[PDB]
DNA sequence: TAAGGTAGGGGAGGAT
DNA sequence: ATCCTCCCCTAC
């Protein structure tokens with residue numbers, strides 16, 4: 001018990017073993033890799049000439065579901081269908097990694113703090129908190145992916161995440177529903193109690209929206225020609241791929257707070273969109289509202305091997321960072337470079353460009369954040385350098401990293417987050 | 429207390 | 445116009 005501090009040689013090890021966000025990233029990176037290894041010898045790209053159907057498959061409230069099926073006996077009293085359940089580490093300003101649909105019926109969301117969530121529960125409803133079961137999340141993911149390959153349904157299976165895949169059926173020149181039902185059934189069995197939803201369409205965007213609409217353990221079909229106002233009206237603006245908190249806020253400020261995608265599509269003009277959120281994004285939203293994919297989004301189908309090929313490598317620590325002097329910082333940077341170099345050498349690459357980025361306590365922010373050991377409100381400072389020659393040498397890299405830190409001049413006591421990045425990777 | 433990581437599109441504004 | 449650095453955003 002008692003958390004390993006940031007000045008301890010195995011801080012990274014212990015922090016990563018506990019951080020679900022690090023797991024998410026690590027699992028994602030490994031899956032991309034596995035895809036590249038399994039397809040070294042397989043013609044893989046899809047063309048303009050090709051006709052295809054997208055089946056976007058995702059586990060429902062993934063950690064919550066798995067953590068519940070694997071729960072210790074002191075929680076046997078729990079009922080997934082009637083009780084609000086979440087997976088998290090703590091009791092107050094702790095992230096709810098995943099919450100079940102009963103919890104969502106009260107307004108609880110993934111990403112919300114436990115303290116926030118409990119305020120949303122009416123008298124007589126108690127929040128149930130489950131621990132993370134990382135190894136089990138991984139075993140269910142493996143079953144999911146092997147099961148997909150085993151049915152011999154798809155021409156290609158793109159791993160998006162530990163619980164999500166974009167599967168493609170190429171159609172040469174009703175069945176879809178039977179297929180959706182088979183996949184859901186076999187995955188439910190190959191996984192034991194887990195559930196998966198499916199969005200099926202002729203565009204990646206619609207498949208993703210259909211997925212959201214199908215979500216509570218089901219499937220939804222919807223093609224470009226099935227679009228209706230009832231379909232639009234059912235989505236929040238940030239249900240669009242590529243639209244998060246800021247884009248939402250900008251869309252709202254520009255088009256008189258539209259509440260559903262239908263309201264947005266009835267009010268927008270391409271030009272205003274572009275002025276509001278960027279053009280490409282504006283352009284992406286524009287196409288999405290007509291059920292069409294932007295070119296950027298399509299590269300993953302026309303060339304998965306290049307899209308899935310890792311182009312950078314880094315660590316980003318923003319919790320538990322508390323230092324008193326530059327010596328501790330230097331040692332931390334050194335260890336960070338040692339960790340990254342282990343990774344770099346594992347994927348047989350060198351780097352020609354590095355970046356040190358840091359989070360510094362804002363002038364106006366409290367010295368200790370509302371969140372225990374959190375970074376709190378901070379300002380970003382970043383600096384990069386081109387290395388003369390691609391290298392994997394600790395000496396060159398660590399020395400430049402330490403040098404970049406002096407240039408940004410953040411007093412150690414103000415440091416609250418730190419990122420070490422290898423931006424351009426060169427081969428062999 | 430509680431584990432706020434990371435890859436990789438993008439755009440602003442200064443350098444060419 | 446294009447390219448580069450230092451961010452911001454989103455995704456999961």
Ligand SMILES: Nc1ccn([C@H]2C[C@H](O)[C@@H](COP(=O)(O)OP(=O)(O)OP(=O)(O)O)O2)c(=O)n1
Nearest residue numbers: 020058059060061062063097098099110111456
């Ligand atoms: N802010 C977040 C979002 C997600 N995740 C983890 C928890 C989830 O189980 C998993 C999957 O992301 P999803 O968006 O797919 O979350 P769910 O699968 O839990 O919800 P849904 O049923 O809406 O797909 O990754 C997390 O730790 N923190």
Ligand SMILES: [Mg+2]
Nearest residue numbers: 058059060061
């Ligand atoms: Mg999911």
Ligand SMILES: [Mg+2]
Nearest residue numbers: 058161163164
């Ligand atoms: Mg997912």
